[PDB]
Design a protein around this ligand. Sequence first.
Ligand SMILES: [Zn+2]
Length: 263
Amino acid sequence: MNHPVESVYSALTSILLPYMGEPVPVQRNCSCCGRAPSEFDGVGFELVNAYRERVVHCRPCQTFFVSAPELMGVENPKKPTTGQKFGMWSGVGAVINVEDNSSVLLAPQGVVNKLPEHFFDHVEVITATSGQHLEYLFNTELKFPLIYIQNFGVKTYELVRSLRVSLSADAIYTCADQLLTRQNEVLYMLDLKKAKELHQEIKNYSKKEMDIFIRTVTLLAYSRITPEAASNEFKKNNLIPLLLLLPTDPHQRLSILHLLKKV
DNA sequence: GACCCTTCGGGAGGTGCATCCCGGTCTCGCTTGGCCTCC
Ligand SMILES: [Zn+2]
């Protein structure tokens, strides 16, 4: 009930209830989220995946494995009778406003084309690829708390177990269907407040100065240039006030630099 | 049957010629249904 998968379900995949079906009561914890059945009210969906594994899904988890061609379009013409699945979407992002329960679907142009017009009524779909997700996050006024599924992907189990609610702009969790262990959440943490202030301060610097700053920071983060050389370049180009806004973590530096080079 | 006394100075390069060219890969880290066999 009080879990991110329920939030995304109610906001985004509660549009496919009429093609979902009646759950079959179960006694084991859902294999997809992994949470105990105490919050599923004792019921569940019994299902077999393409690897012939007996899998239980809860009401939120099962929505990712539902075929609704009449609502989500046909994903592959070679298999008409199965449609686009939220758990099989790769390169498709989604921002879930938990408090408002509204959702925006950042899908590429091909996915938008495959979606029937009935889908756009329930879900507001903006045409954007995986590269323009950060553009949408940057420009749009996000409402918190929210769940930012950067890439729905195909690893639905790792997407559900990666779902983290982003309470504020300081730490926006980019869930991209890769298991969000505490060891790789730095790659999936988007510090949009710092990125926005760094972009605001990038305006004071010339295009050449900002290209030099970005290249120096990227090379240093990959240990291609010595810190002495990078410091010399920063001092010669007067980029120290930019550096004071950088996180000390090189992976965070790379993430925010990707954000800057996208905007 | 004991020492003698051990040389100088020359003069020590010149050239030529330093290639052509190939030809730089497949992959794959996921799930699903369709189709094809087959216990
Ligand atoms: Zn579940």
